[PDB]
Design a protein around this ligand. Structure first.
Ligand SMILES: *[C@@H]1O[C@H](CO)[C@@H](O[C@@H]2O[C@H](CO)[C@@H](O[C@@H]3O[C@H](CO)[C@@H](O)[C@H](O[C@H]4O[C@H](CO)[C@@H](O)[C@H](O)[C@@H]4O)[C@@H]3O)[C@H](O)[C@H]2NC(C)=O)[C@H](O)[C@H]1NC(C)=O
Lengths: 99, 9, 274
């Protein structure tokens, strides 16, 4: 079977402009496990990005956390770009400070 | 504490 | 209170690109503490929590040996599934496995698990009687006959009722500073107008452990069920978890809505109102 990833872009702590934080992209509920996740800053890919070890939920669907250290500003726009076989094209989910 | 998974399908 | 220990393994074949990729991870409750990646350089069961690094090299030799053997068993199990399902040798397939135990507040054995999944669907699973298997299709019934004849469940039960419970009690002790402390959720609420006749109320729960939580919106004491946007509980990245629930309300009717937070670390369930 094939399941579509649910994508969440968020920070580890509430965003304070100028305060060091962590940008998170959490993909969950997908299958198969082959997935491409890229954190974006102003459309550009962030280079040093870590991810958790592959795990899965009770229903056998996988989840992964991609994260990087960042310092939010008023102007900088962040996003997460996910590609998976269940997607017609790479999906970009922009970061909202209240989501 | 891993177990023994040597059983074949 | 009650606690759990789980291992999750995943084998993805890749014909023409080498041996299948094997990845395993171990958890105590919602805390990962070990990992094994067959493509990593160390070729060892690596630690992932601070309270497990104190284990000696004898422990790591034992765990690395058991997880390497599992990796090679799933390698030949992927070939067997091809014959069972009459699938080609060029396709990439997935074999997943979960095993572990649940202990009570005292440490007594409650339930044990040992389950297989092929390509995301159930294959075989150890029943609650720790003796018989749930075969999910005709192919798994071939496996069920093999394992019940070789009394596979007997050795697997001895681990679940013994080695699993003992290791879990040992892990809860070495990491009682983290594993046994519940963080209650810090809650707040935000307000977003969307038009001049509607607005959004978002109920936040942050920094809680363990991950199990319930967020519920109510209108005039009535659960919303529908009309409520609920996100999956997500890892904050520091060992704690987040979750929010949003509801879209007509303007001027904010105070007739309430958010209800239930969590293990809460002495009393919270009720929030804008
Ligand atoms: C296990 O898998 C194997 C392989 O996947 C399978 O054996 C194959 O089955 C297919 C059919 O499912 C066979 O295909 C036939 O091949 C002949 C030539 O070899 C074709 O001419 C046939 O096509 C006719 O039908 C078309 C329909 O429109 C017509 O348009 C066309 O012009 C032809 O008249 C037919 O498809 C194939 O030969 C076998 N063998 C091999 C080696 O692939 C096997 O059945 C599976 N077993 C089980 C239990 O499912």
């Amino acid at each position: 079977i094939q399941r579509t990833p649910k994508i969440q872009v968020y920070s580890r702590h509430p965003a304070e402009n100028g305060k060091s934080n962590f940008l998170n992209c959490y993909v969950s509920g997908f299958h198969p496990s082959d997935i491409e996740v890229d954190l974006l800053k102003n459309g550009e890919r962030i280079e040093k990005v870590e991810h958790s070890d592959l795990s899965f939920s009770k229903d056998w669907s996988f989840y992964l956390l991609y994260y990087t250290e960042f310092t939010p500003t008023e102007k900088d726009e962040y996003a997460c770009r996910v590609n998976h076989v269940t997607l017609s094209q790479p999906k970009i989910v922009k970061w909202d400070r209240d989501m | 504490c891993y177990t023994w998974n040597q059983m074949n399908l | 209170g009650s606690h759990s220990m789980r291992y999750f393994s995943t084998s993805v074949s890749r014909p023409g690109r080498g041996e299948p990729r094997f990845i395993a991870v171990g958890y105590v409750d919602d805390t990962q503490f070990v990992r094994f990646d067959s493509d990593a350089a160390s070729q060892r069961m690596e630690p992932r929590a601070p309270w497990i690094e104190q284990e000696g090299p004898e422990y790591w030799d034992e765990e690395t040996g058991k997880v390497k053997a599992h990796s090679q068993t799933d390698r030949e199990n992927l070939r067997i599934a091809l014959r069972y399902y009459n699938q080609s040798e060029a396709g990439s397939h997935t074999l997943q496995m979960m095993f572990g135990c649940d202990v009570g507040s005292d440490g007594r054995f409650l339930r044990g698990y040992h389950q297989y999944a092929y390509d995301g669907k159930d294959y075989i699973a150890l029943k609650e009687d720790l003796r018989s298997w749930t075969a999910a299709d005709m192919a798994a019934q071939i496996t069920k006959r093999k394992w019940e004849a070789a009394h596979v469940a007997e050795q697997q039960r001895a681990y679940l009722e013994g080695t699993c419970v003992d290791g879990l009690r040992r892990y809860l002790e070495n990491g009682k500073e983290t594993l046994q402390r519940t963080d209650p959720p810090k809650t707040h609420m935000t307000h977003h107008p969307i038009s001049d006749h509607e607005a959004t109320l978002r109920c936040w729960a942050l920094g809680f452990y363990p991950a199990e939580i319930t967020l519920t919106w109510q209108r005039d004491g009535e659960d919303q069920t529908q009309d409520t946007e609920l996100v999956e509980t997500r890892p904050a990245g520091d060992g704690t978890f987040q979750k929010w629930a949003a509801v879209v309300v007509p303007s001027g009717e904010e105070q007739r809505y309430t958010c209800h937070v239930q969590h293990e670390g809460l002495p009393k369930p919270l009720t929030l109102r804008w």
